[PDB]
C-alpha cells in the first residue's frame, strides 16, 4: 500500500484528521501566497516601501507553514509523486533563499521559484488536474512538428549565416566623424558605392563601425544571433523589418527569396501541420467519447425540455377555460402573444432601439440627444410593458423555463437600474442598454437553421463546466508567467531614452497586460529587446533571458490552440450532430402523418468542328494567360512610356482575336451567366479605343475594370469552376456564423463609442490639456538633450483609429481583432480622461478589460468557432458517402493494398568483390557513420562567426575540403556498388550526387566570388530528416495532399494577382518617402512590389498603417505628370485593405482544411490496429526472399516467414511450429504447385487471418464483394481466385 513497513502509531497518527480540514487550509494558504505575490511591487535599485517589508515578513509565516506541511506529509511515508516532488523542491529552495537572505545581508534572483507556488493550486483539486493532463497528452503528436521546426530553423540560420555575414554594420554619418550616428532617429544599414545596397545621396557618407539595427541584436553575425533572428522571422512578427534591413545592406533583388520561402515553409506549412494533427486528435477523442455516451445525455435532455415547454402551457390552457374575469383576461393576452404580429412588433421596436443607440457620435446636435433620451425612455417603458404582458400570460414557471426569456429579463432589469443610476449622476454610462440587440437574432426563427444556432448554445451551456476549467487553466498559466516576468524585469525597464516604455512589468496589472500582449504575438519582439537591454545586453549571459520570451510564446500559443479550438470543435461536433438527430424526427413524424391521412451552314464541318474540341478550348486559355501577363506588366508610376506603349498596343490584337471568337459564339447558341461575362468585359474593351480627350473619369473606372480578365478563365478550366463552386457553398454555409460575429462586433463597437466618445484627442506637447490651449509653437528637445531645442507647432489631433462614431469604432475594433497595433490603442485609451480633453498617464488601467474581453470573445473564440465549423462542415461533406457495405472503411483499403502489392526487386549482384562493396555500403554502421559525419560537417558550418581570425577561416576551409573529399570517396564506392545504371534510380542518391559535384566546383573556385554553391553543403542535412518513420510519413502524406489539390492554391494566386493589379492601378502613383509606410521597399510601383506588399498584408505586419498611408491627401512621384499639390490618393484604401484581409485569410482557411480533409486517414489512424504501415514491411521482408517482383516463393521459407512477422501483423513470441502454422496451412490457399503461390495471395491470407475472419464456405462471398463495391480488379486475381 505504498507504505510496506509501518512505524509505531504513537507519532504516526496523522492520517486521521488530515482528509477534510487539512486539504483546504493549505489551499487557502496557497491562495493567500498568490495574493501576496501579486501585491508585491518591484522597485528599481533596491527601493522599497512598507508593504514590501510586510510581505517579506509574512513570507516567513508562509515558509514555516509549508515546511510543517512537508514534514507532516513525509513522516507519513518516506515524495515519489510527480506533484509532491515539486512542493518539496519549492519548500527547500524557499528555505535556502531565506537563510541566504538572512545570512549574506544574487539571493533575490533565487526567489523567482515563488512563482511555482500557484501551480501547486492545480494539484489541490483533481478537476483541474484531469484537464491539465488532457492538455499535456496532446503534446506527444506535435513532437514531430517541433523537430521539423527545429531542423528548418537550423538550416535557415546556417544559410543566413553564409549569406548575410556582418553586412549590417555600415550606416551614414553626417557629422565629420563618428559621434552620434547622425542618421534621423532610427538609422538603417547602408552600402558603399561599389555595393548594391542603399546609398544616402546627401551630405553624409557611409562609414562602418555600427552596432546594428536593433542595438546589435537582430543580425546574422554568429549562430545564436542568426537562430534568434530566424525564429523571430518564423513567428511572422517583424520579418519585414529584417527583410528591409537586408535590402538596404545588400541588393534588393536577391534576398527576398530567403524570407519569402522561410515564411511560406516555416509558418504557413507548419501551421497547417499543427491544425491537421490537432484536428485528428480531437476527432479521435470525440469518437472515443461515444463509448461513454456523452451525446446521449445531451440528446435526451434536449427532447425533454421541449416536452415541458409544450405541456406546462397545455395544462395552463385548461385553466383559461370557464368550468372569473381573470381567466378571460389571461386567455385574450395568451393568444395575443402567439399572433405572428406581436413578434414583428417587438422586432420593429428592437430595430428602433438599435437605430437610436447607433446614432450617437462626437459633438452630436442637441436635438439628437433629446430625441435619443426620450426615445430611450419610451422604448424602455414599452419593453417593460412587453415583459409584463408575456410574464402574466405564460406564468413564472413557463417564462423562466425558456433560456432566452432569462436573458431579456436580466437585460431589462439591469437596464432600468443603469438608466436611473446615470440619471442621478453617479457615473458615465457603461453601455448595458446595448445588449438588447441580442433580441434582434430572433429574426433567424423565421429563416431556416434557427435551431442549428440553438444547438450550439445548448452545447455551450452543457459544456460550461469544461469551458470554465480550461479558462481557469489559461488564467493560471498567465498569472504564473506574469509573476515570473515581474520578478525578472521588475524596475529594469528604465533607460535614459525620452519615451518611457508602456509595456513593462512594473505592476501586476501591467505585467498581465504585457504577458497578454506577448501571447497575442503583437510586438513581442520589442518586449524581448527591452528585456535583453534590461540585462547586460547582446552578450553571452545577458541574452539567455530571451528564452523567457520564447517558452512563453511557444507554451502559450500552444495552450490557446488547445483551449479555444477544442471548445470550438467539440461543441460544434455536438450541435451539428445534434441537428442531424432532430432533422430526421421532423421527417419521419410527418411521414407518420402522411402515411395515415393520405391512405444554317453552322455545323461541325467548317464553322464548329474545331470550336468545341479541346484544342480550341485550351488555345484561348494561353491567350487569356498572356493577356493577364501583359496587364500585370504595366508601369503605373508614369502615364506615357514606350513600355506602356507596346502593352497598351499589344492588347489591340489581343482583343481582336477575342472578338473573333465571340462571332463563333453567337452562331452556336441564341446562354448561361458566363458567356456574357467575357462579352461584357469585351464590351468594355472597345471603349478603350473611344476615349479621345475624355480621359477625365471614364478611364479612371475603365482601366481599373480590366481586372476581370483572369476570372473569366474559370469557365474554360474545368476543376477551377468546381473549386469556385465549393468555395461559394462554403461561404453560404459559414454565413450563419458570419452574421452573428458581425452583430457582436457592432455591439462591442457601440459600447466602445459609449466609452471613448471623443476622449482620445491629444496635443503635440503633453502640457496643454485642451484644444484652446493647444495653439502656437512649443519647444521640444532632441533626444532629451536640454541644449538642443527645436521649435515645433502645436497640433490638436485625434487618434489614428478612434471611437468618435459607430463606423470609426468598428474600424478600430477590426484592427484590434486582427491583433495589429492593438497595444498602442489600448495604452492610448487607458489615458483617456474626459469627453473633450487630453490624456493623463495611466488614468484608468481598469478599462483594459474592455480590450481584453473583446479579444477573448471575438478574436480568440469567434474565429476558432469559425475554423472549427469549417472543419466539421468539410468532414461531414466528406463523410456522407453512403457506401455502407460489409467493409467499414478499413478493410477496403487493406484489400486494395493486398491487391496492389508486389515484392521489391533484389538487385543483389554477383562478382563478389562488387558484392563485397555492396555488403559494406548497405551496413547500418556505414549509415550511422555518414550521419555522424554530416552532423560534424554541419557543426563546422555553424561555427563561423563575424570578426573571426584568418587562421580560423583557413582551418574551416581545410576541414571543408577534407569533408568534401570524404563525401566524394563515399559517392564513388556507392556508385561502384550500385552501378551507374542503378545508383541514380533513387531520389536520395541523385540528391547527394548533385551536392557533391556542387561542393567541388566552389572548392576549385576557392583556389582561383559567388556563394550559390556553398549553400549546397548545408542541404545534405535534410537527409537526416529521412530517418524517423513517423515524421517522414507525415511530411510525405502532407506533400502528396498539397500535390493533389492545386486549384485551391490557384484561387489564392488569382486573388493575389487581381488585387495587386487593382493596387497598381489605384495606389500605384503615391510618392515614395521614408517616415511613411510607402517607401522604396513597400510600394505599388511594380507588380513584384505590389505582390510583396499584399503578402505582407496577408501576413498582417502593418496593414493598418498602409491603409492610413494610402488615404487621400498625398503627393505622388514627379515621374507622373497647376492643381497638383496633393490631389493624388483615394479613399478606396478602407475597402481595399480590409476586404483583402478578410478574403485572403478565408482562402487560406480553405486551403488548409481541404489539405487536412483528404488526409484524415493518416491523421486518425490508431497505429495499434492493422494498417498500411504494418503491411508495408511485408514487401521489405520478402524482397530478399524473391529475386525479382515475380511472385514465386519457397515452400520452406514460411518457417522464417511466420517468425519474422510482428505480433501486430502476425503472431507474438509463441512457438512457430504450432497453431499459427496449422491455421496457415489449413485454410484455402490457391491450388497451385508446391511453391507457385503468388505474393498477393499469401498477403491476403495473412491479412484475413489477422482480422475479419468468417466461416468456411464464404470465400465466394469475398470473391463477389471484391468486384461489387471494391474498385476494378481487371481480372488479375486468377491465381488468387482460390
Ligand atoms: C500562401 C502562398 C502565397 C504566395 C505568395 C507569393 C509571394 C511572392 C513575393 C514576391 C515578391 C517579389 C519582390 C521583389 O523581388 O522585390 C522587387 C525587386 C525589384 O528590385 P529593385 O528595387 O528594382 O532593385 C534595385 C536594386 N538595388 O524585384 C526583383 O528584382 C525580382 C524580380 C521579380 C521577381 C520574379 C519572381 C517570379 C519568377 C519569374 C521568372
Ligand atoms: C471580425 C468582424 C468582421 C467585420 C468587420 C467590419 C468592418 C467594417 C469597417 C468599418 C467601416 C468604416 C467606414 C468609414 O469610416 O468609412 C470608410 C470609407 C469612408 O472614408 P473615411 O473612413 O470617412 O475616411 C477616413 C476618415 N478619417 O468608406 C468606404 O470605403 C466604405 C466601405 C468601408 C467598409 C468596407 C467593409 C469591408 C467588407 C468587405 C467584405 C468582404 C467580401 C466582399
Ligand atoms: C498565419 C496567419 C496570420 O495567416 C492567416 O491569415 C490565417 C488565416 N489567420 P489565423 O487566425 O492565424 C493566427 C493564429 O495562429 C495561432 N497559432 C499559431 C502558432 C502556434 O504554434 N499556435 C497557435 O495557436 C494563433 C497564435 F492562436 C492565432 O490565432 O488562422 C487560424 C485561426 C484559428 C486557429 C488557427 C489558425
Ligand atoms: C467569405 C468572404 C468573406 C470572409 C469573412 O467574412 C467575415 C465576417 C465576419 C467575421 C469574419 C469573416 C471572414 C473571415 O473569413 C475571417 C476573418 C478573420 I479577421 C480571421 O481571423 C484572422 C486574424 N487574426 C486572428 C484573430 C490572426 C492574428 C479569420 I480565421 C477569418
Ligand atoms: C441598424 C443600424 C446598423 C443602422 C445605423 C445607421 C445610422 C444610424 C448610422 C450608421 C453610420 C452613422 C454615421 C457615421 C458617421 C457620421 C459622420 C459624423 O460627422 C456625423 C455622424 C455620422 C453621419 C453618423 C450618423 C449615424 C449613422 C448614419
Ligand atoms: C519560462 C520558465 C518556465 C522557464 C524559463 C527560464 C528562464 C526564466 C531562466 C532560465 C535561465 C535563466 C538565466 C540564467 C543566467 C542568467 C545570467 C545572470 O547574469 C542573469 C540572469 C540570467 C540571464 C537568467 C535569467 C532567467 C533565465 C533565462
Ligand atoms: C502565376 C502568375 C502569378 C505569374 C505572373 C508572372 C508575371 C506577371 C511577372 C513575372 C515576372 C515579372 C516581371 C519581373 C521584373 C520586372 C521589372 C520591373 O522593373 C517592372 C516589372 C517586371 C517587368 C515584372 C512584370 C510582371 C512579371 C512579368
Ligand atoms: C545545430 C548544430 C547541429 C550545430 C551547432 C551547435 C554548436 C556547434 C554551436 C551552437 C552555439 C554556437 C556558438 C554560438 C556563439 C559563438 C560565439 C562566437 O563569437 C564564436 C562562435 C560561437 C562560440 C558558436 C560556436 C558553435 C556553437 C557552439
Ligand atoms: Ca504584428
Description:
It is classed as transport protein. The entry lists the keywords Cav1.2, Channels, Calcium Ion-Selective, transport protein. The entry is titled "Human L-type voltage-gated calcium channel Cav1.2 in the presence of amiodarone and sofosbuvir at 3.3 Angstrom resolution". The protein has 1282 residues and is mostly helical. It has 48 helices and 6 strands. Strands 1-2 form a two-stranded antiparallel sheet. Strands 3-6 form a two-stranded antiparallel ribbon. The chain has a two-stranded antiparallel sheet with strand order 4-5. A hairpin with a 7-residue loop joins strand 4 (777-781) and strand 5. Helix 2 runs antiparallel to helix 3 and helix 24 packs across helix 25. The longest helix has 52 residues, at 546-597. Bound molecules: 1,2-Distearoyl-sn-glycerophosphoethanolamine (3PE) (2 copies), Sofosbuvir (WG6), ligand BBI, cholesterol (4 copies) and calcium ion. One 1,2-Distearoyl-sn-glycerophosphoethanolamine binds next to helix 10, helix 39 and helix 40.
